[PDB]
């Protein structure tokens, strides 16, 4: 009884899920690398800062 | 300059006793330095017992150094120096025995009244350990200040029975711990197999005896013989007293630091790091 | 810092004061974790304890001989059980005059043989003995249990076997197991829980001084 | 939130007096308390301070040794005990609440005061005493100091209060830029070290009265003369 | 009918697998092989915060990067200032089995929850001076594992009855309920634009949810055991997750497949928390081997170890300006690193 409804719902969910656009992975890798390079000079943990403006150091 | 004169009556001195005392106190001072370092450095063994051990080691080291510095006299008069060193030795040793008594009380909290509770804090420990000796020495010096120092040695004098001001507090302490001791061993012999069921009889009879001997030095039960040195006859008792009590700290470090697995691991890590 | 940070220091210190008090009481409390499918037995025992003293989690608190006791009395139980690491004992209750025994034995084996309960003792309560007396007067033949002795007789040979069955399925010994057959007088129950916890704590204390 | 205080009257010289304040509606035991003073026709003057925990206590310089302050927490009552009263202690007395942690806004509630009649320090000066105004315009006021109020931690300890004709003061600006609660968003404040200006835009009626500027950099606390707007 | 539906499900799964495997033309470690390593990174403890009575289960920074909130077993929630090591607030709770806490973005409210299956919302800025409860939200069946804010009026909750929920606060009523997991739900994380969110739920599976429409959009698999922590990369189209088999993984959303794996042969414990840095060049992980580890995100090596804790690390977090890192563990101490 309820198994039929569960199977129908699972089929509907899989059908709705499989209809998505997709792109390549090298493009995503380039995007992540570009974001990392763009904000490189404003990250103090990766690049330390002088002690005159450091509230903790 | 024999150790027995801390409790002797008949001004008994001999050369070999003095030599043994010198060697023993040297080794003891070294071992006490090691004990204080270890109980100050290793973290995983923090607690009240470690605190009491630390304080006992400190008092013993200081008192032994002062005694070795200022015991012999040239035979002259009595001045400020002799009475000062007498008072210092008195206070050091009486505080040390107060610390041993606190060790006994902690044992009673662990074994008889089992449940964990809010006992004495650190400051009350330091008050009782370092406060009662001040009162005792103050009243002792107020009653009769001419008993400090002797014609031959800078220590308490046999007149008026003044020497009892070191065997009054001491005796009553020992016979207290001498009860607690027995109780502890009894409980162990009723529970050992429950903790560990897989030994032959030999390992049982050796672990129990090593543990008892380890407990026998913290509570001042090796300071009993020396209560009976009152002639030239009792040579054997004096000899055993001197030999045993000149290695107090060496045995403490052997039976309470090296045999501890946590101390072994932490010391190995510390040596590897530094 | 000047003229306000100073004030902002005092406030902070005051908070510490209160916390320093709380640590002096948490150290004195004994935690006991309670389990059992006998809903009626659990309810009756809890009501008796409450009368002596006077869903989620329902914690109860009481005192026996000037010692404070707390009983927690509660799908993936593995994550649910990570929050009870500071306990001292597990109190497991069983119905006897019923059957339902093989399932209770299975649950016992699943619970006791766990990684996170190595240093915990197990107290075992057997409830409803009067009905068992009635049902052993009118003997019901043991279906499969090798009740070698007194099967058409009183339970006094049965409970030895039942205790033996509960004693097995324990793969980690060196922590004792205590038995009990409940009685109407609750002083017996209070005395039993008291002494079990005391013996466990003494056996833990004698280790730290290298027995 | 309600402070009601009592004790005033007319006193012969010498003598003694005991004034009390009762709180109602908040947590009295987490607040510090101040007593402040107002002359018959002049500016305010700070009197004394008691804190939470009954620890720190501060007095002024012109009454020290004669006044004393006390609090009672389980009954929520403040006491001021004053002795040896002269002819210069004739004034209105007010009670003020305060609290100090990161982000708090001290001096956020005042009472209604009481009357008492008898038969070095940083100096700040008001610009003027009166300005002719007209509704619908904009206005600005200034007051001047004699040292920097900028502590090294980034703060600036200057306060701006308002007093309407027949009422008790209400906070307007705390720490030289921030707005208190329950006020219109048409007020603002600015300044540089040793010079400060309050600005009001889009003036409305019921904004007429006398304004005040205070410092809190280090005890004692010091006031200015007071500036007035005449409609 | 059952056989036809099962065959349809199998065919759809095969189609999904083919679609995913079509576009995997390059590997992330193949474009990053020509990039300078970040060298050795080391951080010294700068402040030490003490006062808890038992273990610490969670923490959360603010928006001004100066205030902290922490939750402990003793039923206490404490609000700290990190510049001067001061205590600003100490809040007592009702149920002592607490497992999470969150800090509102405007600065007015906080949240608490645990084994009582109720979420409590607290008001900080009142007129009577106290800190008093404002809402007790109820309606779940099992325990709560996470709760995060969206604005001053909306909350998201994840609970181990396999459920997620969105609550409006003034009324007290549920508005949308997310269903589809098979096991307990363990962690959730919100996006910077506040329109989607991701959850990992103890069944070796993670899912993306659309907060507005109401249904799931994508699902990801690949771990061998359950999943304990999750968080967003700071641009809204990447995330990274940690499991209880000593492995971290980096996933993408616009390609729908795994990208990288952080692991080592000397690690056998689990992972309790994960967080990113401000530029996405540092990933931080808390383990049960008594430490925290500092990885480069883009090439999967090791760069740092933060030692100093005597028990398992439970929580770690990063500020909104990038200056510090905060770690809290089972020894009841918090630490700040710079």
Domains, chain A, ordered by start: 4-56 (4.10.260.10)
CATH architecture of B3-273: Up-down Bundle (1.20)
Give the separation between CA B209 and CA B172, rounded to whole angstroms.
26
Give the separation between CA C139 and CA D34, rounded to whole angstroms.
86
Those residues whose C-beta lies under 8 Å from the C-beta of residue D211, and which sit 6 or more positions away, are D141, D160, D161, D162, D163, D172, D198, D226, D227, D228, D229
Q: How many CB atoms lie within 10 A of CB B116?
A: 15
User: Where is chain D discontinuous (C–N over 2.5 Å), named by the preceding residue?
Assistant: 119
Residue D114 shares a structural domain with residue D9:
yes
Report H helices in chain B. 15-41, 48-69, 80-111, 122-143, 164-195, 201-218, 235-245, 248-253, 261-273
Q: How many CB atoms lie within 10 A of CB B125?
A: 19
Least Cα distance to C98 among C153, C136, C125, C144 occurs for C136
> Is residue C207 less than 8 Å (CB to CB) from chain B?
yes
Q: Is E221 left (phi over 0), alpha (psi -120 to 50) or beta?
A: beta
Residue B146 is classified by DSSP as: G
The whole-angstrom distance between residue B81's C-alpha and the CA centroid of its chain comes to: 26
User: Where is chain C discontinuous (C–N over 2.5 Å), named by the preceding residue?
Assistant: 54, 74, 98
Output the furthest CA–CA distance in chain A (Å, rounded): 72
Q: Which domain holds residue D172?
A: 125-229
Residue D97 shares a structural domain with residue D14:
yes
Pairing verdict, β D57-59 and C121-127: unpaired
Question: Given an 8 Å threshold on Cβ–Cβ distance, is C76 in contact with E97?
Answer: no
Question: Given an 8 Å threshold on Cβ–Cβ distance, is B191 in contact with C173?
Answer: no
Residue E172 three-state SS: coil
CA dihedral A25, A29, A32, A34 (to 10 degrees): -130
Domain end point (choices D62, D83, D118)? D118
CA distances from D206 to D31, D109, D164, D203, E86 (A): 31, 20, 8, 9, 42
Residues of chain D that touch chain C, judged by Cβ-Cβ distance less than 8 Å: 32, 51-53, 55-56, 100-102, 151, 153, 155, 157, 216-219
What is the strand order of the sheet D32-38 is part of?
Answer: D9-11, D114-118, D91-98, D32-38, D44-50, D57-59
Q: What are phi and psi of C71, to 5 degrees?
A: -115, 125
Contacts of C81 in chain E (CB under 8 A): none
Give the separation between CA E179 and CA D46, rounded to whole angstroms.
64
Least Cα distance to B170 among B7, B5, B61, B4 occurs for B7
Residues facing E163 on adjacent strands: E159, E179
Give the separation between CA D54 and CA D42, rounded to whole angstroms.
32
User: Where is chain A discontinuous (C–N over 2.5 Å), named by the preceding residue?
Assistant: none
Domain end point (choices D101, D118, D135)? D118
Residue D135 shares a structural domain with residue D84:
no
**Polymer length of chain D:** 231
Residue E292 token pair: 């925290």
Residue D158 shares a structural domain with residue D81:
no
**Polymer length of chain E:** 338
Least Cα distance to E139 among E106, E110, E171 occurs for E171
Residue D28 is classified by DSSP as: G
Those residues whose C-beta lies under 8 Å from the C-beta of residue C6, and which sit 6 or more positions away, are none
Residues facing D142 on adjacent strands: D197
Q: What is the CATH number of the domain that holds D43?
A: 2.60.40.10
How buried is D172 (Cβ within 10 angstroms: 0-12 exposed, 13-18 middle, 19+ buried)?
buried
Domain map (residue ranges) of chain C: 1-211
Residue B5 is classified by DSSP as: G
Give the separation between CA B60 and CA B78, rounded to whole angstroms.
27
Give the separation between CA E7 and CA D196, rounded to whole angstroms.
80
CA distances from C25 to A20, B48, D78 (A): 60, 18, 34
Give the separation between CA E256 and CA B236, rounded to whole angstroms.
91
For chain E, report the end-to-end CA distance as a whole number of angstroms.
Answer: 62
- Give yes or no for a contact between E160 and C77, defined as CB atoms under 8 angstroms apart: no
Least Cα distance to D66 among D85, D50, D51, D48 occurs for D85
How buried is A2 (Cβ within 10 angstroms: 0-12 exposed, 13-18 middle, 19+ buried)?
exposed
Those residues whose C-beta lies under 8 Å from the C-beta of residue C110, and which sit 6 or more positions away, are none
Query: Which member of C28, C67, C210 has the closest CB to residue B211?
Result: C210
Give the separation between CA B52 and CA B128, rounded to whole angstroms.
12
Q: E1 vs chain A: nearest CA distance in angstroms?
A: 8
> Is residue C203 less than 8 Å (CB to CB) from chain B?
yes
Give the separation between CA D218 and CA D121, rounded to whole angstroms.
9
Q: What technique solved it? A: cryo-EM
The whole-angstrom distance between residue D102's C-alpha and the CA centroid of its chain comes to: 21
Which residue has 């490189």 as its token pair? A40
Contacts of C66 in chain B (CB under 8 A): none
Domain end point (choices D84, D118, D152)? D118
> Is residue C14 less than 8 Å (CB to CB) from chain B?
no
Least Cα distance to B255 among B209, B193, B223 occurs for B209
User: Where is chain E discontinuous (C–N over 2.5 Å), named by the preceding residue?
Assistant: none
Give the separation between CA D227 and CA D209, rounded to whole angstroms.
9
Pairing verdict, β E302-306 and E292-295: antiparallel
> Is residue E128 less than 8 Å (CB to CB) from chain D?
yes
Residues facing E327 on adjacent strands: E316, E335
Which residue has 């576009």 as its token pair? E23
Residue C199 token pair: 């013996």
Give the separation between CA C157 and CA C148, rounded to whole angstroms.
8
The domain total for chain D is 2
* Per-residue exposure over C76-110, b if at least 16 CB sit within 10 Å of its own CB, e if not: eeebbeebbeebbbbbbbbbbbeeeeeebbeebee
Secondary element (H or E) of residue D229: strand D227-230
Secondary element (H or E) of residue E120: strand E119-123
Those residues whose C-beta lies under 8 Å from the C-beta of residue C18, and which sit 6 or more positions away, are E90
Question: Given an 8 Å threshold on Cβ–Cβ distance, is B191 in contact with C201?
Answer: no
Least Cα distance to A17 among C151, E276, E256, E328 occurs for E256
Residue D214 shares a structural domain with residue D148:
yes
Q: D103 vs chain C: nearest CA distance in angstroms?
A: 11
Give the separation between CA B274 and CA B271, rounded to whole angstroms.
5
Give the separation between CA B214 and CA E118, rounded to whole angstroms.
55
Give the separation between CA E77 and CA E70, rounded to whole angstroms.
6
Residue D99 shares a structural domain with residue D131:
no
How buried is C67 (Cβ within 10 angstroms: 0-12 exposed, 13-18 middle, 19+ buried)?
middle
Residue D107 shares a structural domain with residue D146:
no
User: Where is chain B discontinuous (C–N over 2.5 Å), named by the preceding residue?
Assistant: none
Which residue has 């902690």 as its token pair? B106
Domain map (residue ranges) of chain B: 3-273
Contacts of E216 in chain A (CB under 8 A): 13, 17
CATH architecture of E1-337: 7 Propeller (2.130)
Residue C30 is classified by DSSP as: E
Angle between helices B48-69 and B122-143 (to 10 degrees): 30
Rounded to 5°, the CA angle E269-E274-E280 comes to 130
Give the separation between CA E148 and CA E115, rounded to whole angstroms.
17
Secondary element (H or E) of residue C162: helix C158-167
Pairing verdict, β D227-230 and D130-132: parallel
Residues facing E16 on adjacent strands: none
- Sign of the alpha-carbon dihedral angle for E200, E120, E124, E334: negative
Least Cα distance to E243 among E266, E219, E268 occurs for E268
3-state SS track over E257-303? CEEEEECCCCCCCCEEEEEECCCCCCEEEEECCCCEEEECCCCCCEE
């Amino acid at each position: 009884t309820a198994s039929i409804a569960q199977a129908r719902k699972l089929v509907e969910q899989l059908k709705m899920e499989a209809n998505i656009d997709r792109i390549k992975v090298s493009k995503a890798a380039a995007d992540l690398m570009a974001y990392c390079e763009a904000h490189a000079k404003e990250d103090p943990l990766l690049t330390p800062v002088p002690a005159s403006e450091n509230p903790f150091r | 300059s024999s150790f027995a004169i801390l409790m002797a009556h008949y001004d008994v001195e001999d050369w070999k006793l003095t030599l043994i005392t010198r060697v023993g106190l040297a080794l003891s001072l070294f071992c006490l330095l090691l004990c204080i370092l270890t109980f100050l450095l290793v973290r995983p063994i923090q607690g009240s017992r470690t605190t009491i051990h630390l304080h006992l080691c400190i008092c013993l080291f200081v008192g032994s150094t002062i005694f070795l510095a200022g015991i012999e006299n040239e035979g002259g008069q009595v001045g400020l120096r002799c009475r000062l060193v007498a008072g210092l030795l008195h206070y050091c040793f009486l505080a040390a025995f107060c610390w041993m008594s606190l060790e006994g009380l902690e044992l009673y909290f662990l074994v008889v009244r089992v449940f964990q509770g809010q006992g004495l804090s650190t400051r009350w420990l330091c008050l009782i350990g370092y406060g009662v000796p001040l009162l005792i020495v103050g009243v002792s010096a107020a009653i009769y200040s001419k008993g400090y120092g002797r014609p031959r040695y800078c220590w308490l004098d046999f007149e008026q029975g003044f020497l009892w001001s070191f065997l009054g507090p001491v005796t009553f302490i020992i016979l207290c711990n001498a009860v607690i001791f027995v109780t502890t061993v009894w409980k162990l012999t009723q529970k050992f197999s429950e903790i560990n069921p897989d030994m032959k009889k030999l390992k049982k009879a050796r672990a129990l005896t090593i543990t008892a001997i380890a407990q026998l030095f913290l509570l001042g039960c090796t300071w009993v013989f020396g209560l009976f040195i009152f002639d030239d006859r009792s040579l054997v008792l004096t000899y055993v007293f001197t030999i045993l009590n000149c290695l107090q700290g060496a045995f403490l470090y052997l039976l309470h630091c090296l045999l501890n697995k946590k101390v072994r691991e932490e010391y190995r890590k510390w040596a590897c790091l530094v | 810092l000047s003229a306000e940070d100073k004030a902002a220091v005092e406030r902070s210190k005051m908070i510490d004061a209160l916390l320093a008090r709380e640590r002096r009481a948490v150290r004195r409390l004994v935690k006991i974790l309670l389990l059992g499918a006998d809903n009626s037995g659990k309810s009756t025992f809890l009501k008796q304890m409450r009368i002596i003293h006077v869903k989620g989690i329902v914690e109860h608190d009481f005192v026996i001989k000037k010692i404070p006791f707390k009983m927690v009395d509660v799908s993936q139980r593995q994550k649910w059980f990570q929050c009870f690491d500071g306990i001292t004992s597990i109190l497991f209750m069983v119905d006897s005059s019923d059957n339902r025994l093989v399932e209770s034995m299975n649950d016992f084996e699943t619970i006791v043989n766990n990684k996170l309960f190595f240093n915990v003792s197990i107290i075992l309560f057997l409830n409803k003995m009067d009905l068992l007396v009635e049902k052993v007067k009118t003997v019901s033949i043991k279906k499969h249990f090798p009740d070698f002795r007194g099967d058409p007789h009183r339970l006094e040979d049965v409970q030895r076997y039942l205790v033996q069955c509960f004693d097995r399925k324990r793969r980690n010994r060196s922590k004792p197991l205590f038995h009990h057959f409940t009685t109407s007088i609750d002083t017996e129950n209070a005395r039993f829980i008291f002494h079990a916890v005391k013996d466990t704590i003494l056996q833990e204390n004698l280790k730290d001084i290298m027995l | 939130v309600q402070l009601v205080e009592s004790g005033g009257g007319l006193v012969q010289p010498g003598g003694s007096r005991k004034l009390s304040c009762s709180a109602s509606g908040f947590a009295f035991s987490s607040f510090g308390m101040h007593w402040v003073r107002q002359a018959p026709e002049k500016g305010l003057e700070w009197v004394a301070y008691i804190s939470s925990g009954s620890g720190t206590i501060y007095y002024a310089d012109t009454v020290k040794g004669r006044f004393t302050i006390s609090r009672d927490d389980p009954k929520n009552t403040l006491f001021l005990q004053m002795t040896s009263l002269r002819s210069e202690d004739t004034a209105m007395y007010y009670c003020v609440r305060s609290i100090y942690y990161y982000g708090s806004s001290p001096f956020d509630f005042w009472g209604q005061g009481t009357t008492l009649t008898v038969s070095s320090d940083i100096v700040m000066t008001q610009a003027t005493s009166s300005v002719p105004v007209t509704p619908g315009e904009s206005v600005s006021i200034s007051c001047r100091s004699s040292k920097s109020l900028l502590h090294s931690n980034g703060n600036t300890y200057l306060y701006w209060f308002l007093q309407r004709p027949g009422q008790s003061p209400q906070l307007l600006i705390y720490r030289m830029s921030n707005l208190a609660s329950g006020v219109p968003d048409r007020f603002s404040g600015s300044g540089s070290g040793t010079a400060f200006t309050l600005t009001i835009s889009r003036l409305e009626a019921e904004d007429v009265g006398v304004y005040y500027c205070m410092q809190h950099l280090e005890y004692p606390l010091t006031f200015g003369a007071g500036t007035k707007l005449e409609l | 009918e059952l056989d036809q539906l099962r065959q349809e499900a199998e065919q759809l799964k095969n189609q999904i697998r083919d679609a995913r495997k079509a576009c995997a033309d390059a590997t992330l470690s193949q474009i990053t092989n020509n990039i300078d390593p970040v060298g050795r990174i080391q951080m010294r403890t700068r402040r030490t915060l003490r006062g808890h009575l038992a273990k610490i289960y969670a923490m959360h920074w603010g928006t001004d990067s100066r205030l902290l909130v922490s939750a402990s077993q003793d039923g206490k929630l404490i609000i700290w200032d990190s510049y001067t090591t001061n205590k600003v607030h100490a809040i007592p709770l009702r149920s002592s089995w607490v497992m999470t806490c969150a800090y509102a973005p405007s600065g007015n409210y906080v949240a608490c929850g645990g084994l009582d299956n109720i979420c409590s919302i607290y008001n900080l800025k009142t007129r009577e001076g106290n800190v008093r409860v404002s809402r007790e939200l109820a309606g779940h069946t099992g325990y709560l594992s996470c709760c995060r804010f969206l604005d001053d009026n909306q909350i998201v909750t994840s609970s181990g009855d396999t459920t997620c929920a969105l609550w409006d606060i003034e009324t007290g009523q549920q508005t949308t309920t997310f269903t589809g997991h098979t096991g307990d739900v363990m962690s959730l994380s919100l996006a910077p634009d506040t329109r989607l969110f991701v959850s990992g739920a103890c069944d070796a599976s993670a899912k993306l949810w659309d907060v507005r429409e109401g249904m799931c959009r994508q699902t990801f698999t690949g771990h061998e055991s359950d999943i304990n922590a999750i968080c967003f990369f700071p641009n809204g189209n990447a995330f990274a997750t940690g499991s209880d088999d000593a492995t971290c993984r980096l996933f993408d959303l616009r390609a729908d497949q795994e990208l990288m794996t952080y692991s080592h042969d000397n690690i056998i414990c689990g992972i309790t928390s994960v967080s990113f840095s401000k530029s996405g060049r540092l990933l931080l992980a808390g383990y049960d081997d008594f430490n925290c580890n500092v990885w480069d995100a883009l090439k999967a090596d090791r760069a740092g170890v933060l030692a100093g804790h005597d028990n398992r690390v439970s929580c770690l977090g990063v500020t909104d300006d990038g200056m510090a890192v905060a770690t809290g563990s089972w020894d009841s101490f918090l630490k700040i690193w710079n």
